[model samples]
Target: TCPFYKKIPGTGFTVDAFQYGVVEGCTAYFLTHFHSDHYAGLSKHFTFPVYCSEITGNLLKNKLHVQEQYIHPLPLDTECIVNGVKVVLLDANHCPGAVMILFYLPNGTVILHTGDFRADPSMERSLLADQKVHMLYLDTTYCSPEYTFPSQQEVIRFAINTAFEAVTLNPHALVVCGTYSIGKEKVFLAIADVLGSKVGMSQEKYKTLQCLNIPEINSLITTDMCSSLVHLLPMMQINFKGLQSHLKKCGGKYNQILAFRPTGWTHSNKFTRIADVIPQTKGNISIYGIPYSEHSSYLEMKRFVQWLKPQKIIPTVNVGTWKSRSTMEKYFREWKLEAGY
Candidate 1:
């Protein structure tokens, strides 16, 4: 539903790739992450030079099998130049290899595009405090005030504890965690770390984790479900009714299944059979929605906007979130922050 192309008409550099039909005529391209939404339009062979973090580049090369010579990797927290533009890469905090692109234009405009990120103090280091941002392209996924959520660390703690309690209550039960393949690797990994066990994933996720080259997680991944007590299923796999069938197939045996959906949707309080708990298959199946967000909460955004003091904020949501720019700015301006950068 959202398009991932942003260009500085004068600069002529854009982020993310586009299908042949969507948009074209850019000399250079930058990709923030490997999620299809961000990496949507690329053929098996893309001749254009695409720049991204090494992890994302590896995923594209191994998983998508994109042509090798076309891939150019960039290391974060370092400043580099492409086509005479000063480019600074920062961790987006959204997922592995996701990045926020800051481009310094020749016209003296400091433009910051937070592709998709959460507000964490660690991220602020990459942003030069003295530098002024002329334009802010924000990740307004949670721009509305009504959407509220705790920090990702807190949510991860809750998810681990809940799944642990469930597993302890039913040792015979299989702990299933719901999450996207590319995003939210921390959730299941934490659960495995705490439980002192390996994680079971499909072939695709196994390849992804393997390609990621993070030894801490890669060493813990396995295809044998019986080898690991917890099952790390893709968000879609756990949602389908076939989940009932999946649990049964695991050694074709299980006493119960305790699952979790650590997503931002829970923050809205919209869909749930119980408060933060979505009932599934009675007591035999339990699914809870944990408010784990990768994007800034409204308050976080307010603090960032106030700190950056950007003259203009162009939201990237709602038809790229263009509909409620004034609404976002109105609240962003009204909220005052005592001290934060």
Candidate 2:
């Protein structure tokens, strides 16, 4: 996701590509969210001023410890002028602080940089209604046609029910939900809600959760490890080997681990099997892989392109090499013609 300082065409700004040193003409930097891939180069010694949603700014200060003065938090659905360019932040529908940026350039070019979003009807109605766009910088994370899965609600429901059944039968089964630093919060939170269980997380994750300002935060999670059967762990730790060691360290309080790895790769349009989803299960441990993606599906991206129909389209992902770039371009050309753009 870190394309490394690719300047927006005809603008003195960049979005989510901050690995390399600062560009000469870049006046302001925009971060779509707090994912490591997007904020890889950010540090205490960061140079350019950053503009992002308020929640992301909070994470920058509390979690990443970036300086407050350089972080400017913008409101959603409101137009603001930054360095002489008109800009607006619309909810990206991906994570807590993610936003799709809309820019009105000096030369009358309107650019929409969809910062890793799931295309939804609410965005069309509330955030981007009747907009004339010149360029669309899309989040082509799932740009290929082969990528397909159920809606987020469906996955969340399934995950909640699956965890519920596992824990009801075996109350000592530790339930762990896999997550990143920012996204996939809803899955675990929903599990906690349905199970009426307190969540356990590291102090660092607790600090980041505080930045989200979720209501009743103190009631939801705690740093104490023994209090909550339902917990949140980083994506890497949900595996069998990882969970086995984790259970060992828990002093044998948890009889078995019932883990959920919510990612994009597991579910598909084609028929799947329990064996395929449950990749590993040995001893008393069981892991369930749920297809819970924040990025838009290929069909959803196609619908978004048809709705916006921008004159020019730019992909922000899978462009690291010519092989991937050409693959993405193949769909772009096909959709471009389909939309008559």
Candidate of highest lDDT? 2
Indicate the residue-level lDDT of 307 in model 1.
68
- Tell me how far the alpha carbon of residue 121 in candidate 1 is from the true structure, in angstroms, after superposition: 2.6
Worst 10 residues of 2 by lDDT: 266-275
For model 2, which pairs clash?
none
Clashing residue pair totals per candidate (backbone < 3 A)? 4, 0
lDDT by residue (tens digit), candidate 1, 108-132: 8898888888866655555557588
What are the per-residue Cα lDDT tens digits for candidate 2 across 1-341?
A: 32442467777789886786876777888999989988888887785799999999998887768899999999988989898888899998898899989888888888899988998877778647756988888898888887887788888878788888888998888888877668888888999888887789988888888899688888888888888888788788887778887889889798988888877754344687332454468888887778887899889998888888788877888877899889887887898787787
Number of the top-ranking candidate, with TM-score as the measure: 2
TM of each candidate vs. truth: 0.89, 0.93
